[PDB]
Design a protein around this ligand. Structure first.
Ligand code: NA
Ligand code: NA
Lengths: 125, 121
């Protein structure tokens, strides 16, 4: 179960992520905007979601809130994709209920290690 | 097979570039700074060089001048790696003698297409 929903509107980044994931044994799914991401919340369910802070059509925080409203999605791990610089500064220490984050640009190895760490994580408390 | 010298001090970008190129059957060679790049100018020589504008130890422009002064390296294609914002703005229209440029971030498909087009031309 290695289906990864890649919710990232920056095409070069989204495609890079898909490539890294493919080569490391995962099944990446592109979501280039908010509605595209919502339309992937069904069988077969994502095992983990990578999520940018802002998309055409909706924000990352809006998407997380959407996920939490339903039993079938509320336990899917979410890892934020954070742009180095201005965005990173604005969102540091922001509690969203997301499980982890990673800053762009990242190395292929760091992305994979962060995803694997989140996937093996025990359910809190 | 074909040797690509990746001269880039931004580690995540350098590692991404090498990852894409290696899975696509190229032989990427990493250079994280200026001296590392100069140290890779020996047999077997690179088939193409991807080059950042500024490195620890020396600039992209400096490295191009180094390449052009030697008969063995003068015809190796050079593609600049350009960052958005401040850098892209200053290097707009700089006639460096590089064969092409690519703006970061780029997709895997764009990277490979650009290098293959430069090598064919
Ligand atoms: Na975004
Ligand atoms: Na640089």
């Amino acid at each position: 179960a290695r289906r990864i929903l890649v919710v990232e509107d920056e095409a070069p980044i989204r495609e890079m992520v898909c490539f890294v994931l493919e080569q490391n044994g995962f099944q990446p799914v592109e979501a280039e905007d908010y509605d595209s991401a919502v339309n992937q919340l069904n069988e077969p369910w994502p095992d983990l979601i990578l999520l940018a802070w802002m998309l055409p059509g909706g924000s990352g925080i809006q998407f997380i809130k959407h996920l939490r409203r339903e039993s079938m999605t509320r336990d899917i791990p979410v890892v934020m994709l954070t742009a180095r610089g201005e965005e990173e500064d604005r969102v540091r220490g922001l509690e969203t209920g997301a499980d982890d984050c990673i800053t762009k640009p990242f190395s292929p190895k760091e992305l994979v290690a962060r995803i694997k760490a989140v996937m093996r994580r025990i359910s809190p408390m």
